[PDB]
Amino acid sequence: MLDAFAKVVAQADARGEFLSNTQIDALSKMVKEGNQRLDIVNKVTSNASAIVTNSARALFAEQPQLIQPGGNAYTSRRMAACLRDMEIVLRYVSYAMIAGDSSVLDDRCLNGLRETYQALGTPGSSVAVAIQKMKDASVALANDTTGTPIGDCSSLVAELAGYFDRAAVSVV
Amino acid sequence: AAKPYESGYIAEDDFWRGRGIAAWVYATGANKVIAQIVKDFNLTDKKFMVFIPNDGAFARLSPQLRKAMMEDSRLVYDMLAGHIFTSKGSAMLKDLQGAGYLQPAYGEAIGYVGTGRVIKIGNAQVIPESSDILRKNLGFSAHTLDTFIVPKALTKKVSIEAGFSPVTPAKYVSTTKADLRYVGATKPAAVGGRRAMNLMKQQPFWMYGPPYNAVTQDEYEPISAAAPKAFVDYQIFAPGTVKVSPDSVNANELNPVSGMSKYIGKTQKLVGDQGISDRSDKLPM
Amino acid sequence: MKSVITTVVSAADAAGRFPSNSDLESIQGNIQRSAARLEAAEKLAGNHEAVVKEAGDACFAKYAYLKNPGEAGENQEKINKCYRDVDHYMRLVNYCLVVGGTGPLDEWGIAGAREVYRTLNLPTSAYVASIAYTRDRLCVPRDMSAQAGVEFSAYLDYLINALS
Amino acid sequence: MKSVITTVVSAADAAGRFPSNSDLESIQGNIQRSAARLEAAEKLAGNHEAVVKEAGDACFAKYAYLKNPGEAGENQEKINKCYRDVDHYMRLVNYCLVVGGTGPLDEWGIAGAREVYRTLNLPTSAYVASIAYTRDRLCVPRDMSAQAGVEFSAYLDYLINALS
Amino acid sequence: MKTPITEAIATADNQGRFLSNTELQAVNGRYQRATASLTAAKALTGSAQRLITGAAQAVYNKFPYTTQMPGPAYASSAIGKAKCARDIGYYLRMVTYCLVVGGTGPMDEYLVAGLEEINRSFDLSPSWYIEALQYIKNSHGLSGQVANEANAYIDYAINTLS
Amino acid sequence: MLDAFSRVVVNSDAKAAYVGGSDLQALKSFIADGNKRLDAVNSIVSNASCMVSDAVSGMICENPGLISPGGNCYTNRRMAACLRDGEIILRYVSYALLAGDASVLEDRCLNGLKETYIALGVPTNSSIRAVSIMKAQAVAFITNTATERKMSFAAGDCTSLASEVASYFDRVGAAIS
Amino acid sequence: RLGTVSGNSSLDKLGLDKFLSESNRAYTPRAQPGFSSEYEQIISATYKQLFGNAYIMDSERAEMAKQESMFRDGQLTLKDFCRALAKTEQYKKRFFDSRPLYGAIELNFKNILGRTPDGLEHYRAKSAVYDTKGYEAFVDAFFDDGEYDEVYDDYTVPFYRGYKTEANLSMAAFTHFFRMVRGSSTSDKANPNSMQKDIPLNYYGITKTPLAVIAPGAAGTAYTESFAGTGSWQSGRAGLNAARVALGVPATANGKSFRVEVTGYTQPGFGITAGTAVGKLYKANKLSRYPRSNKSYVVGFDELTPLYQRITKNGGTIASITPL
Numbered sequence A: 001m002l003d004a005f006a007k008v009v010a011q012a013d014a015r016g017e018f019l020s021n022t023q024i025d026a027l028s029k030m031v032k033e034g035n036q037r038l039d040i041v042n043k044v045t046s047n048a049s050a051i052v053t054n055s056a057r058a059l060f061a062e063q064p065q066l067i068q069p070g071g072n073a074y075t076s077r078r079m080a081a082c083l084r085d086m087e088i089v090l091r092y093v094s095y096a097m098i099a100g101d102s103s104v105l106d107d108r109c110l111n112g113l114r115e116t117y118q119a120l121g122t123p124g125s126s127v128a129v130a131i132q133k134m135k136d137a138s139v140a141l142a143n144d145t146t147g148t149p150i151g152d153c154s155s156l157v158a159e160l161a162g163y164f165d166r167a168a169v170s171v172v
Numbered sequence B: 001a002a003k004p005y006e007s008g009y010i011a012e013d014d015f016w017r018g019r020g021i022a023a024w025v026y027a028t029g030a031n032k033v034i035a036q037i038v039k040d041f042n043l044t045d046k047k048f049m050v051f052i053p054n055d056g057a058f059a060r061l062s063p064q065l066r067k068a069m070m071e072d073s074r075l076v077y078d079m080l081a082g083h084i085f086t087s088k089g090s091a092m093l094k095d096l097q098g099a100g101y102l103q104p105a106y107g108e109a110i111g112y113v114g115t116g117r118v119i120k121i122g123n124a125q126v127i128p129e130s131s132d133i134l135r136k137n138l139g140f141s142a143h144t145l146d147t148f149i150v151p152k153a154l155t156k157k158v159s160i161e162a163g164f165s166p167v168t169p170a171k172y173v174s175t176t177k178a179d180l181r182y183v184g185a186t187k188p189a190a191v192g193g194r195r196a197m198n199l200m201k202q203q204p205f206w207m208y209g210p211p212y213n214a215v216t217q218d219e220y221e222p223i224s225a226a227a228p229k230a231f232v233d234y235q236i237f238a239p240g241t242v243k244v245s246p247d248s249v250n251a252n253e254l255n256p257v258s259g260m261s262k263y264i265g266k267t268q269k270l271v272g273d274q275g276i277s278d279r280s281d282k283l284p285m
Numbered sequence C, D: 001m002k003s004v005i006t007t008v009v010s011a012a013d014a015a016g017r018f019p020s021n022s023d024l025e026s027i028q029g030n031i032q033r034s035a036a037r038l039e040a041a042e043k044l045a046g047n048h049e050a051v052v053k054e055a056g057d058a059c060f061a062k063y064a065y066l067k068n069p070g071e072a073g074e075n076q077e078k079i080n081k082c083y084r085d086v087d088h089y090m091r092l093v094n095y096c097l098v099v100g101g102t103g104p105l106d107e108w109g110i111a112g113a114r115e116v117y118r119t120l121n122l123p124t125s126a127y128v129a130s131i132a133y134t135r136d137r138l139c140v141p142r143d144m145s146a147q148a149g150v151e152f153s154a155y156l157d158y159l160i161n162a163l164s
Numbered sequence E: 001m002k003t004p005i006t007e008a009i010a011t012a013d014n015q016g017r018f019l020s021n022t023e024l025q026a027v028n029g030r031y032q033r034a035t036a037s038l039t040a041a042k043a044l045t046g047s048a049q050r051l052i053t054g055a056a057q058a059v060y061n062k063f064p065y066t067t068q069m070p071g072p073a074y075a076s077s078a079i080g081k082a083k084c085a086r087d088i089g090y091y092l093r094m095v096t097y098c099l100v101v102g103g104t105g106p107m108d109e110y111l112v113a114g115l116e117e118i119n120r121s122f123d124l125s126p127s128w129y130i131e132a133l134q135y136i137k138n139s140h141g142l143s144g145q146v147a148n149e150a151n152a153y154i155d156y157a158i159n160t161l162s
Numbered sequence F: 001m002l003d004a005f006s007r008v009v010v011n012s013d014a015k016a017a018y019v020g021g022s023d024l025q026a027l028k029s030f031i032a033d034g035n036k037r038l039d040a041v042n043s044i045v046s047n048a049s050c051m052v053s054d055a056v057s058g059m060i061c062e063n064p065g066l067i068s069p070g071g072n073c074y075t076n077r078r079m080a081a082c083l084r085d086g087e088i089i090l091r092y093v094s095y096a097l098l099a100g101d102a103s104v105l106e107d108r109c110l111n112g113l114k115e116t117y118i119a120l121g122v123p124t125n126s127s128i129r130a131v132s133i134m135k136a137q138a139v140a141f142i143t144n145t146a147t148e149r150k151m152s153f154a155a156g157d158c159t160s161l162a163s164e165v166a167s168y169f170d171r172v173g174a175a176i177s
Numbered sequence G: 001r002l003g004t005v006s007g008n009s010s011l012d013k014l015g016l017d018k019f020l021s022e023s024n025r026a027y028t029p030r031a032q033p034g035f036s037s038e039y040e041q042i043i044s045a046t047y048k049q050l051f052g053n054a055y056i057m058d059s060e061r062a063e064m065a066k067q068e069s070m071f072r073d074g075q076l077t078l079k080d081f082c083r084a085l086a087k088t089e090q091y092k093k094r095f096f097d098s099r100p101l102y103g104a105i106e107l108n109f110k111n112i113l114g115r116t117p118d119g120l121e122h123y124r125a126k127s128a129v130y131d132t133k134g135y136e137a138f139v140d141a142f143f144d145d146g147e148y149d150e151v152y153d154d155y156t157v158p159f160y161r162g163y164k165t166e167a168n169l170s171m172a173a174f175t176h177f178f179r180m181v182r183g184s185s186t187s188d189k190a191n192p193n194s195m196q197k198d199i200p201l202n203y204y205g206i207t208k209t210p211l212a213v214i215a216p217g218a219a220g221t222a223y224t225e226s227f228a229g230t231g232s233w234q235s236g237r238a239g240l241n242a243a244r245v246a247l248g249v250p251a252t253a254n255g256k257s258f259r260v261e262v263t264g265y266t267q268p269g270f271g272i273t274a275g276t277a278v279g280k281l282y283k284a285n286k287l288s289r290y291p292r293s294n295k296s297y298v299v300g301f302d303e304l305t306p307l308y309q310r311i312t313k314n315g316g317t318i319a320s321i322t323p324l
């Protein structure tokens, strides 16, 4: 895997170039955010059990056929594996948020997830609804203050929303 | 420095401010360089020819090139020395005809193609509407370009993959009355209480139907299970105080010819609204 | 989707050429016509539950035989699926005014419909009587403007001619 | 004969469908963009005898070696056929403005040209160099209107990319 | 690639847990040191050609047989001289990559993995590249903690060569 | 193949939602900035021949081992195919700029282009550099910063269109990698 | 775009998006004298179909200038032009003279008929025409059997139909179609399973065994495997590809079996450490950790989630999962 600092280095080694003066000034801004990025990863991780469970609770209220006999989440092994997957996706979205690059997200979670759910019969349109419910529980948790100093984080919540949309289109 | 309208505009340093085609040479410090070029190559006696790029040529200059003209003052020197030509002297536009070559002040030699009224100097084009101005004293000809004469021998050091590839940031578009609903689902259900089912949204009206059976948010409230033993008697009140009112006094709105009735029977759950509720009013209890 | 963009791109892809001057001239028609057909798509998207339910019982006001035994409007589930299937068709007309062509109606509503409404024995003249009621309910200055109602009705009788 | 009308009629025929609402919208863009190019073509009509004379001198100025004995511009008779062959290209772009697309260039001027010119030993770079001149002496608010110059330039670069 | 960011992700993904404050502090310390490292990398980039021409000449002064002996391995001809100023620029570019990333990651993936195999095969001496690196440690002109970050990755490559 | 308007339709169809209100304003902005998009697609296809030849030549000038015996662009059959491999890639990028969505570029071009280039043996580092040169040419004609041509436009800013088409070219390098 | 959901479509995002959009139908018996643009499009469309999106240069396209002119007034395009172009040297050089007989036989099924050979008897009926009468009648049996006038109008271009259900083929022929047609930016010179020299469906087209379909443009789209026998009788060798059967006690212990295909295995990235290992780089015996990339596994269901993490954490790319 490689983060956002290692991303521009790998793009520059393949050209055989030193980094520019403009490119160092663009990596100073990524360090200048710095603490605001670590606030989003702190808020998402600290409420990780309640984000997964209460957005599984709201999925079975709107699609109650998934827990009927003959549904894809009806049994204890088949329900516990469903909550386990929703915690796997929230894990690698927080990994992609601390790194600034969606490379650990697809190389270790997403590549082969569509092929897995097509061999098992898991409804892929219902997985993306569970992904989109953890999204707006987390982008509403991102832009509340709650012991953070007041400022503008609207550029880092568009990046966190883009990692949830990436995980949702790799399964739908 | 001073105002350009002093001494008329007869001064050489103030004339190009007056003939306002090249305003970038005084907005930047480029006019110090071309005065230092003709010191350095002794062009003050013999006649020559300049091709000044206009305003708009400086504006269409690329951001991967305009950065490299700031971090390298040697690159600004020979680019401005690449516009001063000493082949034909004070040459007009009619002597720039055919195809041929031209010797710059510093750089190798640059080929021109001049075909009638369109004249190219090699990645440049002379706009001939204002280009035949000749100064008598310190004598040269000045013509106007629309692009800088950029030789390819200078700019193999530049590229767009340095970091000048343009990127726009996209931000999320959520409304503040919607993510205030969604913060209550982040807490666990022992401390979030009733707010733990806040993530379910409004389904369409057929999704609560008997094939699909989507559960409303009110099934998770205690207001669905309000089934008491006690009951109001309604006969112990004064006559005229018990009020009742029907929904519509019509046979055809209470029940249509199909069973899609909003008021009678089990099809009262098939409303397009009334899927979610306001239980972020109270408490996290 | 069959659209204005996807038509002129596919025509210049089968010929193997760049977007010509006549392929940019078609997208300019998509600009001058978008004002009328986005007014109809916004008027429909705000008042859709009242337009669907007004047309859902215009089926059963013309065909009261559908509540007879064995028919398609017997019980509560079958009228829930009937008001759903009308709301599906009104969503696809909202999608066609947004895109600008008959794309979403063709791929999602019309293709395969003759083989389903005959296998399941749903009378296709009753998936029409709700669509034909909405086309004559529209008052041309009251709900939308003049050219917004031209676009709204032209996608409404494309669906009628595709079920007939 | 690629036009805006010809592209949607041939695409409605390829799927066996009637002219839809996605097809009449493309004819609307032909109406809006018509006033731009139809007065550029009026400008090219009454002033073609001087535009090809100016463009004709602009290739023998660049390639002066054509007047050598043994080249394509030896005598006055082979010179007269070059001013003729550039007057044809100015007539075929006058046709592309009133049609609305790259039809009349693609049939009578471009298809078959690069094997005629190779066999008859004519350099295509000099059939280029007169087309790129009238693209360059065109300044947009004097010679025509501001939008007529966009259409007039759009066909000259289409002819240039075809020869080159 | 070894980075303070990616080593925190890899030690939590190996255990299979969420990023705790054990991992949020290891990337907090990368952000504190990043200001010294980014000034050390902007200065080594802007004075690269001075440091490349000088360090190659500093090897020809200590080992003058490398400009004398015939063969393909030595910088006798103009071709072996051009392949030496290319090798110094590879060692210098990996140092500025390690300062930008924040760890000894880019010079692990690109330079020091397989380095003892390509030196023994093409018959290059690691003592040539040490003296080329002792020059850059003595001539970058940096000061303080800016020089502490630059000399930490220069001293890392001298330990693999020796 | 989806355009910009039909992309928000397949996003609304996933949740049985009508398109209206919040989503129609981002599409009404597409119409209002729609004259710029036609005015920018015209700038690329007017120069589409000089762009391709200069991209394959500049790929060769920096890496001149490609025209040696053993290089991939050696003979005349191989050079004429490399000049046509890039003329198609530029054609599909100009479709995605006209549509406003990268679905025609991913469906018809990039899906399968990777295993095309590993069966033939095309060097992916050299083909990325030829795309990179086309990216710099496309931003220069859109933002009018071309040093060899000066196209006429109305006055205004089109940075969002240049940052859009730059993201289409980076999908080409990420696919074949 | 990939997937099956989000658009209510599976075949256009399986590589068939360009092919599901054209007709190219030649609506008039002769080309009109005066105009060339309509019929130049049909000739470029029947070059792209019959040659399988190959590059025909101008020095090679002039070698078929005669037929192109017989078609423009006095020949059909389905018959008599695709038949004329199949007897040319440009078709014969790259589709017949390069491969064995059974390799040339299924390239003609794709190019002329738009499908794949179903079983051995589809191969065997076409090799018998070549053995008795030569190449000139061998390409006529693709045109002059019953199938060709049945499925194509004799003024349209052929199109791909081996995936459809109205082309009454076996379901192993569906999986074989997506081995020979990989999207619209590919030819059979640009196919990794036939590189204009191989037999693309050699064991699988004869025995009718089905393959796992990998979509073009997927993550593990570069997965290819070799072929080797395994038994003592055929003198085979063990340990190259995983089996396709799941026979014994391990088939149903740990639940239902699957067959997983991995693509990219490199030397950097094995350990739990985010970076390469510095040092020796190879053990004594000098071999890699994975001597082949493109490995395959047969795994149970209770071992599928530990294996999934063991693949992706070590650099691998899951190409396909298929229940045995």
Ligand SMILES: C=CC1=C(C)[C@@H](Cc2[nH]c(/C=C3N=C(/C=C4\NC(=O)[C@H](C)[C@H]4CC)C(C)=C\3CCC(=O)O)c(CCC(=O)O)c2C)NC1=O
Binding pocket: A034, A035, A036, A038, A039, A040, A042, A142, A143, A144, A145, A148, A149, A150, A151, A152, A153, A156, E024, E025, E028
């Ligand atoms: C190891 C654990 C660790 C953390 C969790 C963070 C925590 C943290 N955040 C900030 C500092 C900050 N944090 C934020 C972030 C926000 N403010 C808001 O109103 C938004 C809701 C939210 C963005 C999503 C902002 C905006 C600042 C800077 C205050 C300012 O400049 O206005 C600071 C002080 C630095 C400063 O003041 O500049 C610290 C220590 N840093 C750490 O080292």
Ligand SMILES: C=CC1=C(C)[C@@H](Cc2[nH]c(/C=C3N=C(/C=C4\NC(=O)[C@H](C)[C@H]4CC)C(C)=C\3CCC(=O)O)c(CCC(=O)O)c2C)NC1=O
Binding pocket: B221, B222, B223, B224
């Ligand atoms: C632990 C102890 C405990 C209680 C005391 C009750 C308290 C209580 N009552 C209501 C909810 C309510 N409570 C009332 C009651 C009244 N309104 C009147 O006009 C009368 C004055 C009064 C009855 C005598 C009504 C009418 C509602 C429904 C409110 C509404 O949604 O309209 C709710 C909201 C939850 C729900 O709607 O189900 C709660 C927590 N519940 C508890 O769990």
Ligand SMILES: C=CC1=C(C)[C@@H](Cc2[nH]c(/C=C3N=C(/C=C4\NC(=O)[C@H](C)[C@H]4CC)C(C)=C\3CCC(=O)O)c(CCC(=O)O)c2C)NC1=O
Binding pocket: C059, C066, C071, C072, C073, C078, C079, C081, C082, C083, C085, C086, C088, C089, C108, C109, C116, C120, C122, C123, C126, C127, C130
């Ligand atoms: C996105 C596009 C889209 C559509 C247009 C519909 C099309 C459609 N409608 C129905 C299904 C139906 N349509 C009706 C309709 C009626 N009953 C009557 O008495 C009248 C004839 C009529 C009301 C207008 C009924 C009753 C069913 C259910 C059939 C059944 O219960 O067997 C079905 C069968 C599947 C099901 O059970 O829902 C389908 C595919 N579905 C779609 O996905």
Ligand SMILES: C=CC1=C(C)[C@@H](Cc2[nH]c(/C=C3N=C(/C=C4\NC(=O)[C@H](C)[C@H]4CC)C(C)=C\3CCC(=O)O)c(CCC(=O)O)c2C)NC1=O
Binding pocket: C043, C044, C045, C047, C050, C051, C054, C134, C137, C138, C139, C140, C142, C143
């Ligand atoms: C989105 C799609 C859409 C439509 C197709 C129309 C359709 C429509 N019309 C009416 C409602 C009505 N429509 C009319 C008709 C008319 N009124 C006049 O002044 C004219 C003379 C005449 C035009 C023919 C009348 C008189 C009513 C009120 C009576 C009724 O309930 O139908 C209603 C009920 C809601 C209401 O207006 O109270 C609807 C949905 N409106 C929409 O929003």
Ligand SMILES: C=CC1=C(C)[C@@H](Cc2[nH]c(/C=C3N=C(/C=C4\NC(=O)[C@H](C)[C@H]4CC)C(C)=C\3CCC(=O)O)c(CCC(=O)O)c2C)NC1=O
Binding pocket: D059, D066, D071, D072, D073, D078, D079, D081, D082, D083, D085, D086, D088, D089, D108, D109, D116, D120, D122, D123, D126, D127, D130
């Ligand atoms: C209606 C559409 C139409 C066209 C577009 C042209 C295209 C065209 N031009 C030429 C023909 C020509 N084109 C040139 C041109 C040149 N020679 C030079 O010295 C310069 C290189 C260049 C000046 C522009 C000459 C000299 C001929 C005549 C060839 C000859 O005499 O051998 C011919 C051969 C027949 C002939 O004119 O003799 C044709 C078909 N003609 C058409 O009928």
Ligand SMILES: C=CC1=C(C)[C@@H](Cc2[nH]c(/C=C3N=C(/C=C4\NC(=O)[C@H](C)[C@H]4CC)C(C)=C\3CCC(=O)O)c(CCC(=O)O)c2C)NC1=O
Binding pocket: B117, B128, B129, D043, D044, D047, D050, D051, D054, D134, D136, D137, D138, D139, D140, D142, D143, D144
């Ligand atoms: C329809 C075809 C058509 C063209 C291709 C052009 C070509 C053209 N330009 C000029 C004539 C001219 N063209 C210009 C050029 C310009 N003037 C300016 O104000 C701008 C700065 C600049 C635009 C580049 C000038 C200054 C003259 C007069 C001098 C001359 O060239 O003779 C003439 C002679 C007639 C005249 O205008 O006096 C012609 C035919 N005009 C046309 O009608």
Ligand SMILES: C=CC1=C(C)[C@@H](Cc2[nH]c(/C=C3N=C(/C=C4\NC(=O)[C@H](C)[C@H]4CC)C(C)=C\3CCC(=O)O)c(CCC(=O)O)c2C)NC1=O
Binding pocket: F056, F066, F072, F073, F077, F078, F079, F081, F082, F083, F085, F086, F088, F089, F108, F109, F113, F116, F120, F122, F123, F126, F127, F130, G053, G054, G055, G056, G184, G185, G186, G187, G188, G189, G190
């Ligand atoms: C729809 C999209 C679409 C494409 C992108 C191309 C993709 C493509 N390119 C080539 C074929 C080729 N592509 C290249 C290109 C290159 N080699 C290099 O060294 C350069 C890096 C690069 C030029 C930029 C070359 C040289 C060949 C020919 C290889 C050969 O002839 O052996 C072929 C095989 C041609 C054949 O089989 O006859 C295909 C399908 N074709 C398409 O239909």
Ligand SMILES: C=CC1=C(C)[C@@H](Cc2[nH]c(/C=C3N=C(/C=C4\NC(=O)[C@H](C)[C@H]4CC)C(C)=C\3CCC(=O)O)c(CCC(=O)O)c2C)NC1=O
Binding pocket: B062, B123, B152, B156, B158, B159, B160, B161, F047, F050, F051, F054, F055, F057, F058, F059, F060, F061, F062, F132, F133, F136, F137, F140, F141, F145, F146, F147, F148, F149
């Ligand atoms: C080895 C030999 C060699 C070459 C052939 C050139 C090739 C070349 N051209 C450009 C760069 C460019 N190329 C063009 C294209 C054009 N400009 C015009 O004046 C024409 C209208 C049009 C086709 C001729 C444009 C517009 C740019 C960017 C800026 C500009 O020149 O105005 C770039 C930079 C790409 C980048 O930034 O990464 C390169 C390498 N350079 C070389 O070193």
Ligand SMILES: C=CC1=C(C)[C@@H](Cc2[nH]c(/C=C3N=C(/C=C4\NC(=O)[C@H](C)[C@H]4CC)C(C)=C\3CCC(=O)O)c(CCC(=O)O)c2C)NC1=O
Binding pocket: C028, D033, D147, D150, F032, F033, F034, F035, F036, F038, F039, F040, F142, F143, F144, F153, F154, F155, F156, F157, F158, F159, F161
């Ligand atoms: C009618 C069909 C049609 C064409 C023939 C072309 C031509 C064209 N371009 C623009 C108009 C424009 N074109 C651009 C684009 C640019 N300007 C720049 O300074 C950049 C260099 C470049 C890319 C960012 C801009 C900024 C406008 C102004 C109008 C707007 O902002 O929408 C207009 C609108 C001007 C008017 O209203 O008259 C037209 C018609 N485009 C079309 O839609």
Ligand SMILES: CCC1=C(C)/C(=C/C2=NC(=C\c3[nH]c(/C=C4\NC(=O)[C@H](C)[C@H]4CC)c(C)c3CCC(=O)O)/C(CCC(=O)O)=C2C)NC1=O
Binding pocket: A066, A072, A073, A077, A078, A079, A081, A082, A083, A085, A086, A088, A108, A109, A110, A113, A116, A120, A122, A123, A126, A127, A130, G301, G304, G305, G306, G308, G309
């Ligand atoms: C790299 C980390 C990783 C990933 C990505 C992963 C995917 C994965 N998901 C699985 C199952 C599953 N995934 C789901 C999930 C769902 N089904 C639904 O109905 C819902 C819509 C949805 C979630 C709420 C279910 C129900 C199963 C069990 C399927 C079965 O047992 O048949 C299995 C089968 C093994 C098992 O857990 O029993 C794997 C390997 N496993 C991993 O270790």
Ligand SMILES: CCC1=C(C)/C(=C/C2=NC(=C\c3[nH]c(/C=C4\NC(=O)[C@H](C)[C@H]4CC)c(C)c3CCC(=O)O)/C(CCC(=O)O)=C2C)NC1=O
Binding pocket: E056, E059, E066, E067, E072, E073, E074, E075, E076, E079, E080, E081, E083, E084, E085, E087, E090, E110, E111, E118, E122, E124, E128, E132
């Ligand atoms: C980015 C990581 C990286 C490193 C470290 C690297 C080293 C490297 N240096 C090499 C050669 C060389 N290195 C030298 C350098 C020297 N010899 C002298 O006499 C001087 C004392 C000294 C330089 C100061 C010379 C002369 C050769 C050519 C040797 C040959 O061709 O046999 C070669 C042989 C391949 C080739 O010919 O290019 C490699 C792989 N390559 C890499 O890609």
Ligand SMILES: CCC1=C(C)/C(=C/C2=NC(=C\c3[nH]c(/C=C4\NC(=O)[C@H](C)[C@H]4CC)c(C)c3CCC(=O)O)/C(CCC(=O)O)=C2C)NC1=O
Binding pocket: G231, G232, G233, G234, G247, G248, G249
């Ligand atoms: C679920 C338990 C199970 C089954 C069903 C099974 C079948 C099985 N039979 C095999 C071979 C074999 N099977 C036969 C059997 C025969 N050949 C003949 O000519 C006769 C007609 C026939 C029996 C009389 C032979 C000779 C081989 C060795 C094949 C060879 O080496 O070429 C092999 C290949 C492995 C090996 O060579 O040992 C398997 C997997 N193995 C199992 O573990």
Ligand SMILES: CCC1=C(C)/C(=C/C2=NC(=C\c3[nH]c(/C=C4\NC(=O)[C@H](C)[C@H]4CC)c(C)c3CCC(=O)O)/C(CCC(=O)O)=C2C)NC1=O
Binding pocket: G265, G266, G267, G268, G286, G287, G288, G289, G290, G291, G292, G293
């Ligand atoms: C069973 C015995 C055996 C074979 C046959 C074998 C081949 C083999 N060669 C490999 C890589 C390689 N092979 C080359 C070879 C070359 N590249 C070039 O440009 C040259 C033309 C050419 C030779 C000079 C390179 C550069 C790699 C590394 C590719 C990479 O890791 O990205 C790899 C990938 C894993 C690794 O990095 O070691 C394997 C498995 N491994 C084995 O254990």
